Structures are given as structure tokens and as C-alpha cells.
């Protein structure tokens, strides 16, 4: 069944990534898949036009399936056979887009590098989940997708409740 879902994912836009600037700006569409980051509990993000996705018996799409019970890593490592591994891995391609994204100078050895910052899918998805499970509330909540979460990102599309951010407020000197 997940074979059908993956093939349907491929038939459409179908891009699996672990880093994207689309978390910063809605119209960005830069996607990166960092192979070093892939572990057993790695959360992964996905894009297709309008988050169009075939749904299973319980009404879940491919993104919901892959990020449940280490399914992504299990397919990626070949536990479910070489075919599924191949089909899934074909969608892990990078797309370069620097538009609307910051370009900063970070000092290197007597020189500089230009950095174009993009966000991490794992930190958002797994981070929100984790801070939820451990009742951490020293936090803000931000919603990603703008007016159209559906066309932003699968994680953005499903997680309409927003993502958790660490409240990095410092202590203050008192008046009196």
C-alpha cells in the first residue's frame, strides 16, 4: 500500500527534504536532503503541489506514514526491500533557490563566507513533538505556511497547531 503512496508521490511534484528555506518564506522552494542527518528517529519533510496526496485506510497521507514509528528510516535503510528503498530515495533530491532568503557574512580565517540560512525539518517536527511529550512550556508557538499552509509544506499542512519555539528571553535588572 505504501508502494502505491510513494508511486503517487513520484507521479506528482514529490520532493523529500530535511532542510528548506520555505520555513522562512512561503515562495522560496529551496530544498536540501542532508544524508548525514538520517538516523532511526529522524523526522523528514515533503512537498508536492497543494500537498496533494493519496490517503490510506485510516486517512493518512505519505508524510504522516513516513514520520510514524521510524517508517522513513526503515524504508531508507532497506528493511522493507530494495524496491521501496529505491523509490523513496529517488525523491530525496536537492533544489537550489536563494531568493527571498538572507545572505549574511560570517567571518572565516582572515576572510568571510556568505551564508544563506535555511531551516531544519527535524527540529520543527520532532522538536515540537518532543517538547509536547515532555510538557515543556517555556515556549512560543509560530504557524508556518502563511495564508496557504496547504501549498507550503506537508508538515505545515498537517501541523496547523503550529510549531514550538524556545522562549529565549533573558532576565532583567529591576527598577527598584
Amino acid at each position: 500500500m505504501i508502494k502505491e503512496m510513494i508511486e503517487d508521490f513520484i507521479s506528482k511534484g514529490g520532493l523529500i527534504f530535511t532542510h528548506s528555506g520555505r520555513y522562512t518564506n512561503t515562495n522560496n522552494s529551496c530544498f536540501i536532503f542532508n544524508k548525514n542527518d538520517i538516523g532511526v528517529d529522524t523526522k523528514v519533510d515533503m512537498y508536492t503541489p497543494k500537498s496533494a496526496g493519496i490517503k490510506n485506510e485510516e486517512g493518512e497521507n505519505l508524510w504522516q506514514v513516513l514520520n510514524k514509528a521510524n517508517m522513513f528510516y526503515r524504508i531508507y535503510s532497506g528493511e522493507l526491500g530494495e524496491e521501496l528503498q529505491y523509490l523513496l530515495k529517488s525523491c530525496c533530491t536537492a533544489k537550489e533557490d536563494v531568493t527571498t532568503l538572507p545572505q549574511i557574512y560570517f567571518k572565516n580565517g582572515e576572510g568571510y563566507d556568505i551564508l544563506v540560512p535555511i531551516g531544519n525539518a527535524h527540529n520543527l517536527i520532532s522538536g515540537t513533538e518532543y517538547l509536547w511529550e515532555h510538557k515543556y512550556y517555556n515556549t512560543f508557538t509560530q504557524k508556518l505556511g502563511g495564508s496557504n499552509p496547504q501549498n507550503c509544506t506537508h508538515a505545515c499542512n498537517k501541523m496547523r497547531g503550529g510549531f514550538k519555539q524556545f522562549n529565549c528571553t533573558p532576565p532583567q535588572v529591576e527598577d527598584n
Binding site: E96, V98, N108, V116, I118, L131, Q165, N167, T169, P170
Partner: protein
């Protein structure tokens, strides 16, 4: 001799509180290091490190009700510099830079007159350190496992400490600088703690600067 120029009560308005996708609040050490670097660039003053302290800070909407997380605050800055001229010229230069500078997008509206403090040894460094009072400075506490589990278990605060390079940008079409090495990158983090500068034992552990592997660090390492 180690020379420091201190600027008290820097009132900043309209700070971009969002430093990363999962951090909102106090601008990270990268921003203040960046500020020191910019001052050295446009002033010619050699800046070795920077210590920065929170006097006031408030994210808009977090204390009372009224897009891009915006905040306002009052900081105290301390730049370690190398300067072999009279203090007055230095002070004037720093004043003229700070007057038009920006911290994480936030406008500087007001600040005390910059003054110079000198240290012959580690013991005068205490006088230097206490010239900053009152303010809460940032000290590096490092990561034990990862930022989430550290935030829950160690009850500390995550901060951007640099970046990890993901890929080299191959086509420089929309890159404003087509010569400097450009990379797609993502934020790296450490865990930090706040301390009243007077209670910080070794000042070098609150003096931030650039370092290897696209990171910022303190001169004296992890806090004790």
C-alpha cells in the same frame, strides 16, 4: 594591557526576536559578534571580543496584548579592542558608529557615553567587569546531548552559536557578492546561561568572538 570600551544602557527598538526557526528572544552571540566585526570594519578599530549584557528586554505581546517576533530592550556592551592612541578619539569613533548601528534589525535610540577601561592583569579585569553593572551577561554552558533534552533536563536556554554548511551555492545569479564563498547553511546551537556580570568569576568566559567551524565562542571556554 587589555583595553575595553564600554557602552552602558543601549536602548534598542524593533529587534527581530526570531534568531532561528526554534529560537525567539535575546539576539544570539552571533549578532553581537557581528556588530563588533562591523564596527572594526567601518571604523578600523581592532575588535578582539565582545561581552554583552541584558538590562531590559521584552518581546512584544508577551507581557501584555495589543507576524515577525519583534522585541525592545536595553543592553550594555563591552568591546575588547587594541588601541594605541588617546581614549577620547576612540570614544568618539565608537559613539559615531553606535549612533547609526543596528542590533538584529533594531534601531538604537539612546545610549550612555562610551568610556574606556584598562586591565594590567586578571585582577583589574574585575574592575573592568564590574564597570558593566548592572546587567545579565551570556555564558556558554555547552551541549550535553542535544538542545531539546538539555533544555528539559538541564533547564538551560538554547542560542545560535554559528552555522553548518549544507551545500556550496553553484550559480550566483541572485547572489549580491559573486566572489565570496557562498553556502546554503543551517543554524547550530549551544546551551547558554545568564549571570550578573559581577558574579562571573572569569570575564574571559563572557567575552565572545569568532572561531573555527563557523562558530562563535567565549575566550575562556565553557563556564565554571
Amino acid at each position: 594591557m587589555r583595553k575595553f570600551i564600554i557602552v552602558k544602557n543601549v536602548k534598542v527598538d524593533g529587534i527581530n526576536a526570531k534568531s532561528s526557526d526554534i529560537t525567539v528572544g535575546m539576539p544570539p552571540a552571533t549578532t553581537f559578534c557581528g556588530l563588533g566585526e562591523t564596527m572594526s570594519i567601518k571604523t578600523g578599530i581592532v575588535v578582539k571580543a565582545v561581552s554583552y549584557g541584558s538590562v531590559k528586554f521584552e518581546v512584544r505581546g508577551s507581557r501584555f496584548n495589543t507576524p515577525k517576533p519583534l522585541a525592545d530592550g536595553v543592553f550594555t556592551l563591552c568591546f575588547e579592542v587594541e588601541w594605541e592612541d588617546c581614549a577620547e578619539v576612540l570614544v568618539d569613533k565608537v559613539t559615531n558608529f553606535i549612533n547609526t548601528a543596528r542590533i538584529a534589525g533594531g534601531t538604537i535610540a539612546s545610549f550612555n557615553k562610551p568610556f574606556v577601561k584598562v586591565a594590567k592583569d586578571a585582577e583589574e579585569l574585575a574592575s573592568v567587569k564590574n564597570a558593566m553593572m548592572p546587567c545579565y551577561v551570556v555564558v556558554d554552558c555547552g551541549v550535553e546531548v542535544n538542545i531539546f533534552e538539555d533544555a528539559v533536563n538541564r533547564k538551560l536556554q538554547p542560542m545560535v552559536n554559528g552555522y553548518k554548511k549544507l551545500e556550496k551555492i553553484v550559480d550566483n545569479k541572485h547572489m549580491r557578492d559573486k566572489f565570496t564563498p557562498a553556502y546554503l547553511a543551517t543554524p547550530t546551537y549551544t546551551m547558554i546561561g545568564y549571570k550578573m556580570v559581577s558574579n562571573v568569576d572569569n570575564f574571559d568566559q563572557a567575552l565572545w568572538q569568532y572561531g573555527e567551524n563557523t562558530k562563535v565562542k567565549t575566550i575562556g571556554g565553557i563556564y565554571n
